[PDB]
Paper text:
Catalysis by protein tyrosine phosphatases (PTPs) relies on the motion of a flexible protein loop (the WPD-loop) that carries a residue acting as a general acid/base catalyst during the PTP-catalyzed reaction. The classical PTPs hydrolyze only phosphotyrosine (pTyr) residues of polypeptide substrates, while the dual-specific subfamily members (DSPs) also dephosphorylate phosphoserine (pSer) and phosphothreonine (pThr) residues. All PTPs share the conserved signature motif HCX5R(S/T) forming the P-loop, which includes the nucleophilic cysteine and a conserved arginine, which, along with backbone amides, binds substrate and provides transition-state stabilization. In addition to the P-loop, PTPs share an aspartic acid that protonates the leaving group in the first chemical step and then, as a carboxylate, activates the nucleophilic water molecule in the second step. Closure of the WPD-loop moves the conserved Asp residue about 9 Å into the position needed for catalysis.
Structures were obtained of the PTP1B T177G and YopH G352T ligand-free enzymes and in complex with vanadate. In both ligand-free structures, the WPD-loops are observed in the closed position. There has been no X-ray structure reported of ligand-free WT YopH with its loop in the closed conformation. Particularly, for the YopH variant, the closed conformation found suggests the G352T mutation has shifted the equilibrium of the ligand-free enzyme to favor the closed conformation. The G352T substitution in YopH introduces a new 3.3 Å hydrogen bond between the side chain of T352 and the backbone carbonyl of M328 in both the ligand-free and vanadate-bound structures, stabilizing the loop-closed conformation. If this hydrogen bond is only present, or is tighter, in the loop-closed conformation, it would rationalize the presence of this conformation in the ligand-free structure in contrast to the native enzyme. The difference between them is nearly identical to the previous report, and this smaller difference in YopH relative to PTP1B gives rise to its narrower pH profile. Its G352T variant shows a much broader pH-rate profile than WT, with a kinetic pKa of the nucleophilic Cys residue lower by about a full unit. Thus, the different pH dependency of the G352T variant arises not from substantial alteration of the thermodynamic pKa of the thiol group of the cysteine side chain but predominantly from altered dynamic properties that affect the factors described in the Introduction, which distort the kinetic pKa values from their thermodynamic values and affect the pH dependency of catalysis.
Residue numbers in the entry: 187 to 468
Write the structure that this text describes.
Amino acid sequence: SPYGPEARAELSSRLTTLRNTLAPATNDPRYLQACGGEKLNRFRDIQCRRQTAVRADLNANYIQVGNTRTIACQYPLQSQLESHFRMLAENRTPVLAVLASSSEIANQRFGMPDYFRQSGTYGSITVESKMTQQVGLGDGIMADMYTLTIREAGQKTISVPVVHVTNWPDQTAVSSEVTKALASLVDQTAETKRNMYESKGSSAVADDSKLRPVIHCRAGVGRTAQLIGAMCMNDSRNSQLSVEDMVSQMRVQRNGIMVQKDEQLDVLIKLAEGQGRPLLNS
């Protein structure tokens, strides 16, 4: 009954209205606008909430779901790579979770630069990629780890752990068991990195805007939202936060598409049910 179909229909009713309301109008004040001709949004109809935007020229948002602070973004465009690495370094990013598959990245019709599996140079920024370990998450889903070393003349060199899930297909939900395992791996990767900064006295430890996990897929609204929802539910401080509130918060802080497919919401509903976490408010 709390997770029964009538309660599920009510959750969908509420979240669908929210989706329709957040649809970007033309020159929408709620959404970041492109400057002078540069393409900003990888998908025209998938925009970046202005109040929470990380950088003027990225489709990327600060996300806070209850107490859990991340960054969700689209796969950076080729023209956005220099700005994307600056965001990564400035955030002292404890983990970068890439959920776009190897097949999507390889498909050049998609304009998805291979920016974390290859060493490269992007304006003043030089990036060195090194593949570390590989990890299975269940159901055949595979993760490849890298560390990206981001150098720039006169800037502090930052190294970012990368978790790349290689075969989560677009517009699907991986299983709740896989989702729980991926959230654990991303959280643990981030904790290890944060601990390193802490052990060296890093002042970025006390700054809420920093040390956030950075997560993207292709648009940064389907698979990305499912992972953030799970990471949210893996933060004990988020006791009693309902599914309605978690998705609403993602949607008001990014766009109305966060949690894109019904199947992805179903995995959030299933994790919540396993916790005894409410679906609805009141």
